Amino acid sequence: MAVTEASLLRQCPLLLPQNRSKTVYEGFISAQGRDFHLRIVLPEDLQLKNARLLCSWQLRTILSGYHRIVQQRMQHSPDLMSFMMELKMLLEVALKNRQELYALPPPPQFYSSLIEEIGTLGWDKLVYADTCFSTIKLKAEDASGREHLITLKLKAKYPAESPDYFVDFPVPFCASWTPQSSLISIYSQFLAAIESLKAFWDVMDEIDEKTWVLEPEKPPRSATARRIALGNNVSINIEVDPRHPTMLPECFFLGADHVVKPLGIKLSRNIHLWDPENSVLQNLKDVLEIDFPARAILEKSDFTMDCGICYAYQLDGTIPDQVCDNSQCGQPFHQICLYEWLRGLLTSRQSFNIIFGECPYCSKPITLKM
């Protein structure tokens, strides 16, 4: 309704005016099918500018990190009605944010049916489950004998809504979910995507074997790019179209302007001799008229000795000089880059001409002396 006589009943069913002068309200506020204890003393007039509002320990732990919000809402808001609206919505928000802690599944469907369906699969298939049962991640095999993983995140009602399927491989996986479909349905769709994309995988597996892949190191399955090393202090990066892998990629070469020119000219001339019936290697070898080195350096592949902020050597005379005091990062920086970066952060403090603050990559103590 309009007036807060009936609209307040309708919108806060469990807030009871204890006193006749409707000044003390007490009891319950709803949010996400759960009722919270709240005692909201007004002054003798209806002014929230000054009021008492006390909580249960349940409520205060859940409204940790909005205390100021609620305190300001009290002083700014005109009516109780609107104030409760703001509070309700704010609780809604707080619980969906802290979704980790708060599940009551309906077990008789859930935990039983999940076990039935996982039995229907067969017991090699699962790899992981969180204790809150929320995460599962599974395996499937290729005809090649390659392991391929899938993350599913399951809701309160698995069979009702879609389970969110989160997955490696490079084109979007799409799942025909019905409420009548189950884990074996989405599993079948996943085996279908496996058998489909085999060519793209075969191509990238051949590359990782025969050549010095440089920039991705133990590459994931989502990777379409492969910075191949060839001769020395010159690299070629190649990105591939996934559905027609065998077809030509956008190719280009990095390194010395005197070394890079002849290859580019030769590519121009010999590109009509690319054919999508052979492999990318068998086409690159006859186009570029060379064979490649098969890990000319495997141990010192590259350490990007470049800023690790702007990722460049030579910023206005300055070189990558400032490093991490850490075995696991070792990451060089520029004075300029690392000063510009640390000058922002809350953790770092500035001594006379000295700044202690966290290495960007590894978050360990790093010191900069200007």
Binding site for another protein (CB under 8 A): 66, 69, 72-73, 75-77, 86, 89-90, 93, 97, 151, 162, 164-168, 170-174, 215-220, 222-224, 239, 241-244, 247-252, 254, 264-265, 267-269, 271-272, 304, 306, 308-312, 339-341, 343-346, 352, 360-361, 363
In the numeric block, which tokens belong to residue 127? Answer: 């790899």
Spatial distance between the Cα atoms of 234 and 214, rounded to a whole number of angstroms: 11
- Which one of another protein, Zn ion, none interacts with residue 67, CB within 5 to 8 A by kind? none
Strand partners, 339: none
Spatial distance between the Cα atoms of 303 and 216, rounded to a whole number of angstroms: 12
Spatial distance between the Cα atoms of 63 and 87, rounded to a whole number of angstroms: 10
Q: Confirm whether residue 324 is marked as ligand binding.
A: yes
DSSP 164: E
Q: Confirm whether residue 307 is marked as ligand binding.
A: yes
C-alpha to C-alpha distances, 98 to 63, 102, 312, nearest whole angstrom: 11, 7, 41
Question: Which C-beta is closer to another protein: that of 109 or that of 162?
Answer: 162
**Residues 29-88 within binding reach of Zn ion (CB under 5 A):** none
For residue 324, state whether it binds Zn ion (rule: CB under 5 A): yes
Strand intervals (E) in 200-298? 212-213, 228-229, 235-239, 250-254
Query: At its nearest, how many Å lie between another protein and the CB of residue 73?
Result: 6
Question: Which C-beta is closer to Zn ion: that of 61 or that of 314?
Answer: 314
Span from 37-45, 188-196, 221-229, 325-333 in contact with Zn ion (CB under 5 A): 325-333
Spatial distance between the Cα atoms of 139 and 149, rounded to a whole number of angstroms: 5
Q: Minimal CA–CA distance to 298: which of 229, 370, 206?
A: 229
Spatial distance between the Cα atoms of 256 and 234, rounded to a whole number of angstroms: 7
For residue 224, state whether it binds Zn ion (rule: CB under 5 A): no
Biggest CA-to-CA distance, the chain:
96
Site string for Zn ion, 278-317 (x = CB under 5 A): -----------------------------x--x----x--
Site string for Zn ion, 331-370 (x = CB under 5 A): ---x--x---------------------x-xx--------
How many other CB atoms are found less than 10 A from the CB of residue 320?
A: 21
Q: Residues within the annotated binding site for Zn(2+)?
A: 307, 310, 324, 329, 334, 337, 359, 362
| Contacts with Zn ion, residue ranges (CB under 5 A) | 307, 310, 315, 324, 326, 329, 334, 337, 359, 361-362
